[PDB]
Paper text:
The ferrous iron transport (Feo) system is the primary prokaryotic Fe2+ import machinery, and two constituent proteins ([name] and [name]) are conserved across most bacterial species. The function of [name] is unknown, but we do know that [name] is an ≈8-kDa, cytoplasmic β-barrel protein comprising an Src homology 3 (SH3)–like fold, which is commonly involved in protein–protein interactions. Interestingly, in some pathogens such as Porphyromonas gingivalis (the causative agent of gingivitis) and [name] (a commensal organism implicated in drug-resistant peritoneal infections), the feo operon is predicted to encode a single FeoAB fusion protein in which [name] is naturally tethered to the soluble G-protein domain of [name]. Herein, we provide the first biochemical and biophysical characterization of the soluble domain of the B. fragilis FeoAB fusion protein (BfNFeoAB).
However, after ≈11 months of equilibration, crystals were obtained in ammonium sulfate and dipotassium phosphate that were further optimized by grid screening. Despite the age of the crystals, diffraction was routinely observed to <2 Å resolution, with our best datasets extending to 1.50 Å. Initial refinement revealed the presence of two molecules of only the [name] domain (BfFeoA) in the asymmetric unit (ASU). After iterative rounds of rebuilding and refinement, our BfFeoA model converged with Rw = 0.192 and Rf = 0.236. The β-barrel is composed of five β-strands, while two α-helices make up the clamp region of BfFeoA, which comprises a series of hydrophobic residues (Phe23, Ile27, Met30, Ile59, and Leu61) that we have hypothesized to be important for mediating [name]–NFeoB interactions. An additional 310-helix at the beginning of the N-terminus contacts both the final α-helix and β-strand that feed out of and into the hydrophobic clamp, respectively. Residues comprising both the linker region between [name] and NFeoB are completely absent from the structure, likely a result of proteolytic degradation in the crystallization drop over time. While sequence analysis of the [name] polypeptide does not suggest this is a common proteolytic site, the new C-terminus created after proteolysis is unambiguously present in the electron density. The overall structure of BfFeoA is similar to other [name] proteins that have been determined by NMR or X-ray crystallography, including the hydrophobic cleft putatively involved in protein–protein interactions, suggesting that the [name] domain in an FeoAB fusion may function similarly to stand-alone [name] proteins.
Residue numbers in the entry: 1 to 74
Write the structure that this text describes.
Amino acid sequence: MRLSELKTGEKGVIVKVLGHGGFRKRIVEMGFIKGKTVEVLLNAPLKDPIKYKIMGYEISLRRQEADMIEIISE
């Protein structure tokens, strides 16, 4: 499933960052690396961005960016 599908309080593990080269390197550089848990701190309906936590850091992504990250839910 895509990361944007997780609701507030849910967790998953990154399996793949999709998109083109520039987008991928941008997202991976924020800390979205394979095999680490991502926790949803706030996915508020219709509001942008979504607030995540991974590698111990708070990171916000636009919903359309989180649409492009494949995860497996915990």
